[PDB]
Amino acid sequence: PLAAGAVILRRFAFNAAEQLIRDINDVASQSPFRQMVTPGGYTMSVAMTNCGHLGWTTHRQGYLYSPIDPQTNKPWPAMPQSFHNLCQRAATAAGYPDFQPDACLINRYAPGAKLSLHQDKDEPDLRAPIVSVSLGLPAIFQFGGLKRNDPLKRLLLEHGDVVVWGGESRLFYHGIQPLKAGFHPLTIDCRYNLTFRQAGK
Numbered sequence: 001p002l003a004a005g006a007v008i009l010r011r012f013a014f015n016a017a018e019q020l021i022r023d024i025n026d027v028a029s030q031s032p033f034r035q036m037v038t039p040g041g042y043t044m045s046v047a048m049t050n051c052g053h054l055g056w057t058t059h060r061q062g063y064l065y066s067p068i069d070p071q072t073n074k075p076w077p078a079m080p081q082s083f084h085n086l087c088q089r090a091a092t093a094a095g096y097p098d099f100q101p102d103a104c105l106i107n108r109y110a111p112g113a114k115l116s117l118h119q120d121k122d123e124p125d126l127r128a129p130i131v132s133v134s135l136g137l138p139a140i141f142q143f144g145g146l147k148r149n150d151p152l153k154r155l156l157l158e159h160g161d162v163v164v165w166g167g168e169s170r171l172f173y174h175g176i177q178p179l180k181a182g183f184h185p186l187t188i189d190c191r192y193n194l195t196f197r198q199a200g201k
């Protein structure tokens, strides 16, 4: 059992990937990818956008979920059908049939992009899982435990892999190591990851 509460579904989204990527591009045509600035003043190497009713974003030197994209002053694009359906199939298979995300954060990793170790604790109910979908180039996902200094474990996440982070794992510190450059036939030179969240109360 790699991470208590987590359910790894390798290649679960492999068949859906081309459609998912088309929908990423459609979302980004409305709410573009942008590299947000952390509360500490650093520009993230990962570029982000969102779809759904709520979107994860910097605002006033903190993080929060907002119904409005600060870059466009318009709502985030609606949740694509492909996104909704894939998430529900994965969550249901993993034992979370009532998971109803209202936010999907879309991350784009260019070579060298990384995410420092952190917890996702900005959501109102931490009993709801987060569903992660990997597309394109492979990345090393690192995760520890409930404490910042718990022992780290690592696993490669490859194109089409889905992880449902539930139970205890929902609160683990985690991150992504600097992305290795390469080629993928559907994303060309990057990785994307979708993370579905229940962000509304």
Ligand SMILES: O=C(O)c1ccc(O)c2ncccc12
Residues within 6 Å of the ligand: 115, 120, 130, 132, 133, 134, 141, 157, 163, 165, 174, 175, 176, 193, 195
């Ligand atoms: O699955 C991933 O690649 C991933 C990457 C970066 C994150 O901040 C995440 N947060 C929660 C769940 C998954 C992820």
Ligand SMILES: [Mn+2]
Residues within 6 Å of the ligand: 118, 119, 120, 174
């Ligand atoms: Mn995270």
